[PDB]
Write a protein that binds this ligand. Sequence first.
Ligand SMILES: Cc1cc2nc3c(=O)[nH]c(=O)nc-3n(C[C@H](O)[C@H](O)[C@H](O)COP(=O)(O)O)c2cc1C
Ligand SMILES: CCOC(=O)/C(=N\O)C(C)=O
Length: 367
Amino acid sequence: NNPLFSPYKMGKFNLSHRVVLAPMTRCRALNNIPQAALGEYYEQRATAGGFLITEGTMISPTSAGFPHVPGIFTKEQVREWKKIVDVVHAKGAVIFCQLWHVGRASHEVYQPAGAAPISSTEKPISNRWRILMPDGTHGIYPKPRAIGTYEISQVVEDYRRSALNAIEAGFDGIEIHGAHGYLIDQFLKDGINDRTDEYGGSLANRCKFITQVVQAVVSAIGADRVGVRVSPAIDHLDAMDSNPLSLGLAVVERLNKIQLHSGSKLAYLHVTQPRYVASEEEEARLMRTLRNAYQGTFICSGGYTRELGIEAVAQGDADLVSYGRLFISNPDLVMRIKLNAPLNKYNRKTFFTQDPVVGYTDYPFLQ
Ligand SMILES: Cc1cc2nc3c(=O)[nH]c(=O)nc-3n(C[C@H](O)[C@H](O)[C@H](O)COP(=O)(O)O)c2cc1C
Ligand SMILES: CCOC(=O)/C(=N\O)C(C)=O
């Protein structure tokens, strides 16, 4: 029996299997408005009792660092998301919206009035990394503006309002993108956060921002509708920490405490495998250490295959396994994993293009 097809109770959500659509930016949401193409894409991948997480979704006008990514901060966006959620729900799937602020991982071209992007720090991402521009060229990450505590409270409110908007659109819940060197990770990582106020210095202070964000969304929509994604060890956008395992455990402690205070568990903790990029034992150590420390559901992501996903669930390393790239090219990935059917190759060249069909909805199902 395939352990990926054991049912799982993710809080009040009864999942029929443990294969999850990982959140993936695809850049088809023209002008930050969800489009009908997204509805077709998510519908193709939805299964009865399966869990889907959307592409990262803007919480405010300053939260983007990619072209044509959806927002959920306007009523127009909420109206269009509702059409997509309705088609996914008609297939019996559960869907969460990932709330995403990129912080310093942006460019003047993506910011209102060409202003600098915001961060914990004035330190830019280094020139080892370049940003995808709307014309398909690559640009230079600029120096961000370091925000004060009033503005931090405004950003927390943007997460809270976006969570309420997601519920209004019919989403089952939201995921906080606290990973991958984006805004929240720019507060978490000691390689980035050079602040001397209450949001920097100590590990406890560096965890303040994520704690406040999670508390705000939990208060607004309930813990069982909130998932949290982190990546304490990741090679992405110069987001390093001197002690990744202690950073991860400090975040896990905060999430455990939020749950005890709220009297309810979060939907899940979602952790990226350190092997994933845009020793193996230290990486496996870290994943299992975080899972064992967290009082709740654990989703693993990053480089998983059918075999590795089966092993993760069978060995108790994770409750759910999210797949990215293979879900791009296999709309029926769940069925293919169930049948052990051969998988289709994916085309990286069309990961972030704008076409509503090509490289998006035209990967074939099984015959
Ligand atoms: C095209 C693409 C876009 C992605 N965008 C996001 C994103 O918006 N938010 C996020 O948390 N992770 C994002 N990721 C990481 C994925 O959620 C996932 O963790 C990763 O793809 C898993 O590894 P796999 O592709 O080997 O299955 C993205 C990955 C890809 C390939
Ligand atoms: C490498 C880790 O970063 C990611 O996967 C990502 N978003 O989180 C994108 C847009 O690629």
